[PDB]
Design an enzyme around this catalytic site. Structure first.
Site, mmCIF file in Angstrom:
data_model
loop_
_atom_site.group_PDB
_atom_site.id
_atom_site.type_symbol
_atom_site.label_atom_id
_atom_site.label_comp_id
_atom_site.label_asym_id
_atom_site.label_seq_id
_atom_site.Cartn_x
_atom_site.Cartn_y
_atom_site.Cartn_z
ATOM 1 N N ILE A 48 0.846 -1.188 0.000
ATOM 2 C CA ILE A 48 0.000 0.000 0.000
ATOM 3 C C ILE A 48 0.882 1.239 0.000
ATOM 4 O O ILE A 48 1.802 1.351 0.819
ATOM 5 C CB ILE A 48 -0.947 0.019 1.214
ATOM 6 C CG1 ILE A 48 -1.713 -1.302 1.321
ATOM 7 C CG2 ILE A 48 -1.896 1.205 1.139
ATOM 8 C CD1 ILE A 48 -2.492 -1.432 2.606
ATOM 9 N N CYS A 49 0.597 2.172 -0.905
ATOM 10 C CA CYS A 49 1.232 3.492 -0.894
ATOM 11 C C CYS A 49 0.281 4.441 -0.173
ATOM 12 O O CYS A 49 -0.734 4.864 -0.731
ATOM 13 C CB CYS A 49 1.546 3.972 -2.306
ATOM 14 S SG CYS A 49 2.325 5.605 -2.360
#
Lengths: 151, 74
Positions: free
Chosen positions: A88-89
């Site tokens: 996840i960014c």
């Protein structure tokens, strides 16, 4: 003995979640290690992930809450800011982390990310490009992947 | 820098215990008694599906910090 403060804080958040359950998510250890949690969230309404069941893993560091937990999707998802490994960014997991943040707030932020992606800071640029230029194609694929993988 | 383990039950919130690797299962049972009121002779402790016997210590079972035990009545 290295992670006394982390474990006390992780335990407090666990019991805080039990006393006041989140509306849209659950989180806790499923094995025999308090450092390793599993979480589930609902795909937000008014988003192409609506109705999907997404499983996540949470790995707390031994210097938590000074460092963020490592959070990733186990369910496959079509999203500009989540790659095929489930990474996840998300800013609050990289450098906007603050020790005042909790798993509860992280789950809310992840839910917010599913509703409103950040295509200008992508993990999968080709998905971000589709999001930016052909929204309905992205919506179609995201919905189809929600049926395939999260239902 | 201290050691913490956890005790999972069907009916109660996660219990946190402060321990040392030299602590025995009776010691752990005694600490459970202080926090929950459950007598040690009534407690069965399980780690990774292995029964925990009162004479042993936590380092005997390789229970590290952050480990979660199971508690059932006996």
């Amino acid at each position: 003995p290295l992670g006394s403060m982390a474990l006390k804080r992780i335990h407090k958040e666990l019991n805080d979640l039990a006393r006041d359950p989140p509306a849209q998510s659950r989180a806790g250890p499923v094995g025999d290690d308090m450092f390793h949690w599993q979480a589930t969230i609902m795909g937000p309404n008014d988003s192409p992930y609506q109705g999907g069941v997404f499983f996540l893993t949470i790995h707390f560091p031994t210097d938590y809450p000074f460092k963020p937990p490592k959070v990733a999707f186990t369910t496959r998802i079509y999203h500009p800011n989540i790659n095929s490994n489930g990474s996840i960014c998300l800013d609050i997991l990289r450098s906007q982390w603050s020790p005042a943040l909790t798993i509860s707030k992280v789950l809310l932020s992840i839910s917010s990310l599913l509703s409103d992606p950040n295509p200008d800071d992508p993990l999968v640029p080709e998905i971000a490009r589709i999001y930016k230029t052909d929204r309905e194609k992205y919506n179609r694929i995201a919905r189809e992947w929600t049926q395939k993988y999260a239902m | 820098d201290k050691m913490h383990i956890f005790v999972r039950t069907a009916t109660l919130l996660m219990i946190i215990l402060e321990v040392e690797p030299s602590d025995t299962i009776e010691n752990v049972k005694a600490k459970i008694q202080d926090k929950e009121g459950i007598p040690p002779d009534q407690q069965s402790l399980v780690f990774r599906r292995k029964q925990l016997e009162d004479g042993r210590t936590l380092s005997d079972y390789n229970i590290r910090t952050g480990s979660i035990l199971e508690l059932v009545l006996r």
